[PDB]
Structure 1
Amino acid sequence: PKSMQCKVILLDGSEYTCDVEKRSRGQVLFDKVCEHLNLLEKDYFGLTYRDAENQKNWLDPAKEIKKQVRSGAWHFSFNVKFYPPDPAQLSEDITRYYLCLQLRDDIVSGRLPCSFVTLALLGSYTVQSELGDYDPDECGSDYISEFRFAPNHTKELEDKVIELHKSHRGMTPAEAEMHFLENAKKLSMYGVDLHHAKDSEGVEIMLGVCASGLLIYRDRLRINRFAWPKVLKISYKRNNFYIKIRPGEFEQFESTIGFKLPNHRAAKRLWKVCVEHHTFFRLL
């Protein structure tokens, strides 16, 4: 019974290798990866793969792997799919640990923009979690941490991490990770999946998908936000994506709002992530 080798990049940067039957649904591989990670609160996570256009796609656990990766390698990443708006409500510390690992990559990558002071505070909690109480013996005036804290490291940032790390004496790893998450969850781009688009006039915009709803980023002064309950239908057609808005109070007609995506694949991808978010955050 023929099996395909799968390679999964984990959130710590290491590689997990396993075999699944070649006609396996995504759930088979995801279950193996979550068992490897000792992860029970699996609903927030997913696997990604790169399509023939090198775009990130979620592996649908309900569909055959072979019908998603198609002609590409069986190579995946383990990622947070649904960012909990309140990580304190998660039942296990280990779930919060994986969510911290994802957010550290979101920060270093620049997907999650962050002030100097918040970069330093987040860094200080990671250092406290992983090394424990501050020790001057490992850091003179010229200390640089092996830890990656930011898209661009400066001596000033390193110095501020150390100053805040000193303040965390006695803090345990779960406690430090919770403080990490209490800060990160407040960031304006926390858990926002961004998609390049044009408005119905051809003006370049960004669509953000998140727990609360759909964001349109237009000209810096114009951000429009559509809470999920205001959204009755998500649809795509060719390179176009549309949202059907509930009729407002005393309004006779629903309204549909339309956007242009880079290509058909990008419109279908944005539709699927919106539907998934709407379903997940309707139930959570």
Structure 2
Amino acid sequence: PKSMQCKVILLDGSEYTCDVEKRSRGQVLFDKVCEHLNLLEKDYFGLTYRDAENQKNWLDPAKEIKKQVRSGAWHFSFNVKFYPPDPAQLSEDITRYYLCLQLRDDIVSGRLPCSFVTLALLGSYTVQSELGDYDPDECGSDYISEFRFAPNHTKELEDKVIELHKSHRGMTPAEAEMHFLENAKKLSMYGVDLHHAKDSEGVEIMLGVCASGLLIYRDRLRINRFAWPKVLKISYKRNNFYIKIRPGEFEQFESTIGFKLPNHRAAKRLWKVCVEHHTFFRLL
């Protein structure tokens, strides 16, 4: 039996290495990573790889790894796939812990925009979880944390983290992680997967996919939101992605909103993440 070496970037930035038989389905590797992580609530998570076009793709657990990575390296990342709208309802603290690590990266990367005060509050809960109670000894007026808190660090933000960290004395890691998630879950881009597209008139928009439904970001004004109940069906053809929307009750016919994606692959990728998120919605 011939086995391929797999390298997986974990949410703490460490690398897990294992082998799978070369015709292995994605689930085989995913099970090995989750066992390494002591993770039972596996449904929220997945592995990504980078394609020949360098786009992040989800590794489909039901398909051969080799028919997805194709010409590319067997290099993957471990990631949150379905962000729980209410993380307090997860059964295990360790689930919440990996969700916090993912969200920290969402924040530092700028995928999850955040006010100054929310960056400092989230950062203060991370410090409480990682270092425990505030200690003046490892913190003068000139202190800068090793922790990455934001896409752009300022001394003002470092000071605000320390100020809020002082208020969390006696908080356990599980408690701090739960506070982190109660704040993060409210942010308007929490759990939103963004895709570049053009509307039917050729104007550049972003489509967001999340637990609640689909968002069309025309700009900061003119955000269109379709709760999953309103979304009839979703399809792709060539470079095109089509959303059918239920009529208002007493209306005869659904509406169709069409979008142009960069290429056929970007259209199929959006379709798949939409179908996967809708099935998530129906199981809540």
Task: Give yes or no for TM over 0.5.
Answer: yes
1:28-53 per-residue CA deviation (whole Å, 9 max, x = no partner) reads 00000000000000000000000000
2-structure distance, mates of 1:54, 1:237: 22
Distance in structure 2 (CA, Å) of the matches to 1:218 and 1:245: 18
Whole-angstrom distance in 2 between the partners of 1:181 and 1:39: 18
Q: Deviations over 1:132-175 (max 9, x none)?
A: 00000000100000000001111000000000000000000000
Q: CA deviation at 1:219?
A: 2.6
Report the Cα distance in structure 1 between the residues aligned to 2:24 and 2:245, rounded to whole angstroms: 38
- Tell me the distance in 1 between the aligned counterparts of 2:269 and 2:220: 25
Q: Could you tell me how far apart the structure 1 residues matched to 2:170 and 2:217 are?
A: 42
- 4+ runs deviating over 6 angstroms: none
- If the length of structure 1 is used for normalisation, what is the TM-score? 0.99
User: Within 2, Cα distance between the matches of 1:219 and 1:98?
Assistant: 32
The answer for the alignment partner of 1:122 in structure 2 is: 122
Q: Any idea what the Cα deviations from partners look like across 1:86-111, whole Å, max 9, x if unmatched? A: 00000000000000000000000000
Residues in 2 aligned to 1:149 and 1:96: alpha-carbon distance in whole angstroms:
18
Q: Which runs of 5+ in 2 are unaligned?
A: none
Aligned equivalent of 1:93: 93
CA-to-partner distance for each residue in 1:55-106, whole Å, 9 max, x for gaps?
0000000001000000000000000000000000000000000000000000
**CA separation in 1, counterparts of 2:257 and 2:223?**
15
Shift of 1:195: 0.3
Per the alignment, in what secondary structure is the counterpart of residue 141 of structure 1?
coil
How far does residue 280 in structure 1 lie from its aligned partner after superposition? 1.1
Q: Say which SS state the counterpart of residue 77 (structure 1) adopts.
A: strand
* 1:10-41 CA-partner distances (Å, limit 9, x unpaired): 00000000000000000000000000000000
Instruction: Give the superposition deviation at 1:220.
Output: 1.8
Q: What's the counterpart of residue 38 of structure 1?
A: 38
| Seq. identity, % | 100
> Aligned to 1:225, what secondary structure does the other structure show?
strand
- Aligned length in residues: 284
Alpha-carbon offset, residue 242 of structure 1: 0.2
User: 3-state DSSP class of the match of 1:82?
Assistant: coil
Whole-angstrom distance in 2 between the partners of 1:135 and 1:121: 17
Q: CA offset at residue 266 of structure 1? A: 0.4
Aligned equivalents of 1:281, 1:99: Cα separation in 2: 19
C-alpha offsets along residues 199-256 of structure 1, whole Å, 9 cap, x if unaligned?
1001100000000000000032100000011112110011100011123200101122
Deviations, residues 165-195 of structure 1 (Å, cap 9, x unaligned): 0000000000000000000000000000000
What's the TM-score, normalizing by structure 2? Answer: 0.99
Once residues 221 and 247 of structure 2 are traced to their aligned partners in structure 1, the CA distance between those partners, rounded to angstroms, is: 26
Structure 1 Cα separation of the partners of residues 256 and 198 of structure 2: 16
Query: What is the alpha-carbon distance in structure 2 between the residues aligned to residue 219 and residue 121 of structure 1?
Result: 28
Q: Counterparts of 1:161 and 1:151 in 2: how far apart (Å)?
A: 15
- The farther-off stretch of 255-264 and 102-111 is 255-264
CA–CA distance in structure 2, aligned partners of residues 281 and 252 of structure 1 = 26
Give 2:180's aligned residue: 180
